[PDB]
From Swiss-Prot:
Disulphide-bridged cysteine pairs: none
Magnesium listed as a keyword: no
Protein name: Outer-membrane lipoprotein carrier protein
Location of this chain's protein in the cell: Periplasm
InterPro entries associated with the record: LolA/LolB/LppX, OM_lipoprot_carrier_LolA-like, OM_lipoprot_carrier_LolA_Pbac
Cited function: Participates in the translocation of lipoproteins from the inner membrane to the outer membrane. Only forms a complex with a lipoprotein if the residue after the N-terminal Cys is not an aspartate (The Asp acts as a targeting signal to indicate that the lipoprotein should stay in the inner membrane); the inner membrane retention signal functions at the release step. May act as a regulator of the RCS-phosphorelay signal transduction pathway.
Keywords: Chaperone, Periplasm, Protein transport, Signal, Transport
Pfam families referenced in this protein's UniProt entry, alphabetically: LolA
Gene: lolA
UniProt similarity note: Belongs to the LolA family.
GO biological-process terms attached to the record: lipoprotein localization to outer membrane; lipoprotein transport
Length: 183
């Protein structure tokens, strides 16, 4: 079905590099922010969303830990990546697991998909994505529990092995680290 069709199209492009424009709303239409950025993905769970405009930042997953670094405050936050599953759009695409797509109600129409959560086990209200049968993600968006909309419009995609270094992070000297990984 539409759920299996979605996992298959995404399996078409195991690793890639993409450029995106970000449009964030507020449920009230009044734009909250804007920006652009680069996205590196490597199925199963590696990804690196590196925004540049207006505020440069990095959300990188090494498969085990999720790192959020914002140089505008020497701040890096660390959480176990498993505690992040199904809470962000980058999470669902990166993971791209049957088990993930299962917890949603999906409606497809060509390359458009609209996913709505069945129960309550996440921070998302709605996730949409436009992916071609070739695995090419032209765009996707998300809506959190506070009706906030985050929409990403593709500009350029290049399937193919991605540099492994793009999926690692080491907190710099002098940077304040908030390691929320209980252990």
């Amino acid at each position: 079905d539409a759920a299996s069709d979605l996992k298959s199209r995404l399996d078409k492009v195991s690793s890639f590099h993409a450029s995106f424009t970000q449009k964030v709303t507020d449920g009230s239409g009044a734009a909250v922010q804007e920006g652009q950025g680069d996205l590196w993905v490597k199925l199963p769970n590696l990804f690196n969303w590196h925004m540049t405009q207006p505020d440069e930042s990095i959300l990188v997953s090494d498969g085990k830990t999720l790192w959020f670094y914002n140089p505008f405050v020497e701040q890096a936050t660390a959480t176990w990546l498993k505690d992040a599953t199904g809470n962000t759009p980058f999470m669902l695409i990166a993971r791209n697991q049957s088990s993930d797509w299962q917890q949603y109600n999906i409606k497809q129409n060509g390359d458009d998909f609209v996913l709505t959560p069945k129960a309550s086990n996440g921070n998302l209200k709605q996730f949409t994505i436009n992916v071609g049968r070739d695995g090419t993600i032209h765009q996707f968006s998300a809506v959190e529990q506070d009706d906030q909309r985050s929409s990403y419009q593709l500009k350029s995609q290049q399937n193919g092995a991605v540099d492994a270094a793009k999926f690692t992070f080491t907190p710099p000297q002098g940077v304040t680290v908030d390691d929320q990984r209980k252990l």
